[PDB]
């Protein structure tokens, strides 16, 4: 069961990182956008992935929101996959 | 099935408490941080753990956000574990 989870966990980190980069790439050039520096963008992707998203940061551009949906999806899927495996194992 | 869940529920409370303490510990010294007293910090950890997080409170510092990720993860995992067991049992 450490494979079905382990795999997802990889994809998750890859998405979080790529997402944080693409968001800053997509949001810049957007007047009033606040998702425009890497560090906080990484924090943004994680709170989104885990689907918590406090709203302190979020995207305002199309591609930013497209990056968003992918991060959310990857997130749900990953965490659900790790939970499925972790549950089964027990 | 009252073990796979019971276990997680322990970890959950432990994390919520430790999280509430570490957040206040991490956020203080951060100009403008609002996650700086225990009581509300405990409320913050729970709304995060359950992944609701209304955004009335959230961390603004690195370690605060690191505490955050652990709380979220513990939260998803715990609740998912309790739901898996509770579902199976039925």
């Amino acid at each position: 069961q450490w494979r079905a989870a382990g795999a997802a966990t990889v994809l998750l980190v890859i998405v979080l990182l790529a997402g944080s980069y693409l968001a800053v790439l997509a949001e810049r050039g957007a007047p009033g956008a606040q998702l425009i520096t890497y560090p906080r963008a990484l924090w943004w992707s994680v709170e989104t992935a885990t689907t918590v998203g406090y709203g302190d940061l979020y995207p305002v551009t199309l591609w930013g929101r497209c990056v968003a949906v992918v991060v959310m999806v990857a997130g749900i899927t990953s965490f659900g996959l790790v939970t499925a495996a972790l549950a089964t194992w027990f | 099935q009252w073990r796979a869940a019971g276990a997680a529920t322990v970890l959950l409370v432990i994390v919520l408490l430790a999280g509430s303490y570490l957040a206040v510990l991490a956020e203080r010294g951060a100009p403008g941080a609002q996650l700086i007293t225990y009581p509300r910090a405990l409320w913050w950890s729970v709304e995060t753990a359950t992944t609701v997080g209304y955004g009335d409170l959230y961390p603004v510092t690195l370690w605060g956000r690191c505490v955050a990720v652990v709380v979220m993860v513990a939260g998803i995992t715990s609740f998912g574990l309790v739901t898996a067991a509770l579902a199976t049992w039925f």
Partner: antibody, heavy 118, light 106 residues
């Protein structure tokens, strides 16, 4: 050692156009953004635009009139700002700076004094 | 876009004294404000980043304070080498912006 190298000067006749440069050195990442700041004598700093060489995208200041076009050249680590159809107004010192994507400009260029005269 | 108000434009202080330059944001920007020094004919020089975080190679004479919309750059015991133009710059919302500037004067 000096990180951003900019040509000390560049003369230009009204209506003409010059392509300034800025060659890098030292540490480089894919998260690096090169910015350009205009500064007329006496007055302060004015952000003009930015570019991410490790992708090539550039955004420009929408308040001011667009008179520039940023480009980069990965290999030579050189960023280019193309200023077209200049006028007395465009004459000033232009600095390029490196931003680690964290919001502040750690290091700046010596700046290129540009004069628009006949 | 965010407006950085730097006033007064000139500050006259006596040597060794403490001086404070203030920068006000048109809206809350947390602590995403950064300070630069620029001496006559020099290029800008990062002094303080993120409002308070220090920078290596910069006198401990320099310090920052504030959050939201009100920021202060300080100098303890000014001195000839400190005569310059100080600017504040924010990275809260795009596109980054600059302060009008504040000339120190001993």
């Amino acid at each position: 050692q000096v990180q951003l190298q900019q040509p000390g000067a560049e003369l230009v006749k009204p209506g003409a156009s010059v392509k300034l440069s800025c060659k890098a050195s030292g540490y480089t990442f894919t998260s690096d953004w090169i910015h350009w700041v205009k500064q007329r004598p006496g007055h302060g700093l004015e952000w003009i635009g930015e570019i991410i060489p490790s992708y090539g995208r550039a955004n420009y200041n929408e308040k001011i009139q667009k008179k520039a076009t940023l480009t980069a050249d990965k290999s030579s680590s050189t960023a280019f700002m193309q200023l077209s159809s200049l006028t007395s107004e465009d004459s000033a010192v232009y600095y390029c700076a490196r931003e680690r994507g964290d919001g502040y400009f750690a290091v700046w260029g010596a700046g290129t004094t540009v004069t628009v005269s006949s | 876009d965010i407006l950085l108000t730097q006033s007064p434009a000139i500050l006259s202080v006596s040597p060794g004294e403490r001086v404070s330059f203030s920068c006000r944001a048109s809206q809350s920007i947390g602590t995403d404000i950064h300070w630069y020094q620029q001496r006559t004919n020099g290029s800008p020089r990062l002094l303080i980043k993120y409002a308070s975080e220090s920078i290596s190679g910069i006198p401990s004479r320099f310090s920052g304070s504030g959050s939201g919309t009100d920021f202060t750059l300080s100098i303890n015991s000014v001195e000839s080498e400190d005569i310059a133009n100080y600017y504040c710059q924010q990275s809260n919302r795009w596109p980054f912006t600059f302060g009008s500037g504040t000339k120190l004067e001993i």
